[PDB]
């Protein structure tokens, strides 16, 4: 009966928690206590990218570490040449309420979506001189919160309804649907080998998915409120999540447990965007208090502060070569830091 | 300095900037509004009337054009979104106003409507965003009050001790009891409004029927008022 299934679920959860406690012998703080702190980190604003009419919700760096796509609520994607602050393209959108954007690894496509419930994919390199909508993907019943490219023909989208989906771009249809969340899915991060990906939802749980099979390998529940951002460690064996409980948490897939928490007594606003550095020694996390902090991912010590925005930081992206960190906010300015 | 191709790249960027300037005028001369309500509230009738008078299966947002005195207006409402609202409501903190249509002739879901209005009003991101509530379906309210079969006293105990405010202006001439009831509903919403406003945003009551043709004018007057007040705070007059 339903009571029997409920009791079975409770027993399974208890068994899982007992196993997780069994695998816990020394906290990462103890094993890291004997390394040199990174010391104070000062980063300066190198470029300010002006031109966006309204607040910016998303950004994505290019794999060439020079091009940059930015999305704003006024209904535009602007592709910036970060070195010279030139504008390469200005793509007008049908729906102005765009709140995700991605830049294809090959550099041929850019995707965007939002409250329109459609993941629109744009072709940058056409025989004509303009950028055209290659194809619009429909099928999500909620807002599209994040989308990421696996190759030029596959895209992974997270949506307002409790569902992620893997799309074929040539044939609009969904190849696989990922279900299991009990709340809105807000973020998404692909593994470096592009075989696994994690999604953070509004149920205070993060799940690691299997792209090929389509089943949830593990579920991570340590947070106290909804998760706003998520990103893989460059190893492929960890990820960090920022939630509305004003804390960032680092999980491990192999231990399947929460390692370390980055919290401060002063900080009460929630994290809105989380990104690692190349080595993973730094964990840059945006906040609602207009400032982005830098945490030592191994020691939970606040190393630096990136304070240059007159409104909340909505997006945050570290480039592939590690030379720069880009930050977008609701004041319609992007900033390249170094 | 910089080579010929870089000259041409900068010139293309300048062309893009000029196009962006043209967009800005239209973008800043057009006022955006968010339409909210329940399933029973006649907001579909309001949007149909506004679309007719002036100016794709799982789509999540619908957009409406209308123009009053050579001033443009956008009116969005959410179509496919789920019942949970705390995440996508943040995208609408720069709108001129929020239009909250509520069905005043239900008496049963009206407490849920009050709770929804309370959540909208006290939202951390929807501060400095005023609300234009349309206490819709007034003719059904009149019919149901004059019928007498269903009473408001049992849903809201405080109605027995309530009395009509002196500022009420029943224009056409109707039974005073329906006027008392409708002003009681308005005062409940206004109580939730004035509990914790702090003067950053206001609430504009209006009694409307879905057939009424003054809704566009009424939104225009309210939006004019909001912009004026905002301008006062912006030009350092208060």
């Amino acid at each position: 009966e339903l009571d029997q299934l409920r009791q079975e679920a409770e027993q399974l959860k208890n068994q899982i928690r007992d196993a997780r406690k069994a695998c816990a012998d020394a906290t990462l703080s103890q094993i890291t206590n004997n390394i040199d702190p990174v010391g104070r980190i000062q980063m300066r604003t190198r470029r300010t990218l002006r031109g966006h009419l309204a607040k910016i919700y998303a950004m994505h760096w290019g794999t060439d570490s020079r091009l940059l796509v930015s999305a704003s609520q006024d209904g535009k994607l602007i592709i910036w040449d970060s070195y010279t602050t030139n504008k390469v393209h200005a793509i007008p959108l049908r729906s102005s309420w765009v709140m995700t954007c991605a830049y294809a690894p090959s550099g041929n496509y850019v995707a965007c979506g939002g409250l329109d419930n459609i993941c629109s994919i744009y072709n940058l390199k056409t025989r004509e001189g303009n950028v055209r909508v290659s194809r619009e993907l429909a099928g999500h019943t909620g807002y599209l919160s994040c989308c990421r490219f696996l190759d030029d023909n596959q895209i992974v989208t997270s949506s307002g309804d409790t569902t992620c989906a893997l799309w074929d771009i040539e044939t609009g249809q969904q190849t696989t649907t990922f279900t299991g969340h009990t709340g809105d899915v807000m973020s998404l991060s692909l593994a470096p080998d592009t075989r696994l990906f994690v999604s953070g939802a509004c149920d205070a749980s993060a799940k690691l998915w299997d792209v090929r099979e389509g089943m949830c390998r593990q579920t991570f529940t340590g947070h106290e409120s909804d998760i706003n951002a998520i990103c893989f460690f460059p190893n492929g064996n960890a990820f960090a999540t920022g939630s509305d409980d004003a804390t960032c948490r680092l999980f491990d897939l192999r231990a399947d447990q929460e390692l370390m928490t980055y919290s401060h007594d002063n900080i009460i606003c929630g994290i809105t965007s989380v990104s690692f550095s190349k080595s993973g020694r730094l964990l840059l996390a945006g906040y609602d208090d207009f400032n982005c902090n830098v945490w030592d991912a191994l020691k939970a010590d606040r190393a630096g502060v990136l304070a240059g925005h007159d409104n909340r930081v909505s997006c945050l992206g570290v480039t592939d070569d590690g030379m720069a960190v880009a930050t977008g906010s609701w004041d319609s300015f992007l900033k390249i830091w170094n | 300095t910089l080579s010929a191709e870089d000259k041409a790249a900068v010139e293309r960027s300048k062309m893009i900037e000029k196009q962006l300037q043209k967009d800005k005028q239209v973008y800043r001369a057009t006022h955006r509004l968010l339409l909210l309500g329940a399933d029973n509230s006649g907001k579909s009738t309001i949007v149909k009337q506004m679309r007719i008078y002036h100016v794709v299966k799982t789509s999540g947002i619908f957009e409406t054009k209308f123009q009053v005195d050579k001033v443009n207006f956008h009116m969005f409402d959410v179509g496919a979104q789920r019942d949970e609202r705390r995440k996508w409501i943040q995208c609408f903190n720069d709108v001129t106003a929020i239009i909250f249509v509520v069905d005043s002739s239900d008496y049963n879901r009206l407490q849920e409507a009050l709770n929804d209005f309370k959540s909208i009003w006290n939202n951390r991101w929807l501060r400095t965003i005023s609300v234009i509530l349309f206490l819709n379906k007034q003719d059904l309210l009149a019919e149901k009050v004059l019928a007498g079969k269903s009473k408001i006293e049992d849903y809201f105990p405080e109605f027995a001790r309530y009395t009509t405010p002196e500022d009420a202006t029943p224009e056409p001439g109707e039974d005073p009891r329906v006027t008392r009831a409708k002003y009681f509903i308005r005062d409940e919403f206004l109580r939730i409004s004035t509990a914790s406003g702090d003067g950053r945003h206001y609430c504009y009551p209006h009694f409307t029927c879905s057939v009424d043709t003054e809704n566009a004018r009424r939104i225009f007057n309210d939006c004019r008022d909001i912009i004026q007040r905002m301008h006062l705070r912006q030009y350092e007059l208060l």
Partner: single-chain antibody
Amino acid sequence: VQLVESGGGLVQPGGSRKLSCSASGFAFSSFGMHWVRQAPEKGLEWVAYISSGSGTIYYADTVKGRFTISRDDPKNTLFLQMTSLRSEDTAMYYCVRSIYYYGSSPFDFWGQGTTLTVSASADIVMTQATSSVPGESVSISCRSSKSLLHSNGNTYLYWFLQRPGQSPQLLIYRMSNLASGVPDRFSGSGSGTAFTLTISRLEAEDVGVYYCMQHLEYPLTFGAGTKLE
């Protein structure tokens, strides 16, 4: 995309003629455009360039005052008004399409050309090797008077192939990037002054004249070009 231009014929010396280039199939207003000509038996030579939005107009030294260039975006045509035609203007005028942003491919498309006949300093000199050279591998070479490497990191060298009937089509841009549609056989290399173009497996359609280009500074000189047979 296509660029059809017309307006050529016999003209008495000292006369005037207007050449128009009708464009269709691409976003015309966003493409800067050039005019390139070649004498009945000589190499190509740059004439004029009009930018996107008509804000930057350059002319070659030999036509500095005689010609004027203009475009009509709504009508989607490109003009070249010529006045006082000398006898050294007999050529086939080509209509060239070029765009400029980071990563772009200038000079990607060329027009068919018009036949025009007239009755009886510190610029980069591009010098080609002897103008005569299946399954084999050829290594057409080139040289420049001034280093084509810039502080940006891009060396502006362009390779063009002209087959016997058609107008030239781009093969390599910025000496390393294969143009869209060119087979993987072609590849380019160089060091700043000397450059080479290599065809790994020559085929029947690879015969023609190979012209090079510099795009570091105006005017854009070409070079005589090498003939494969």
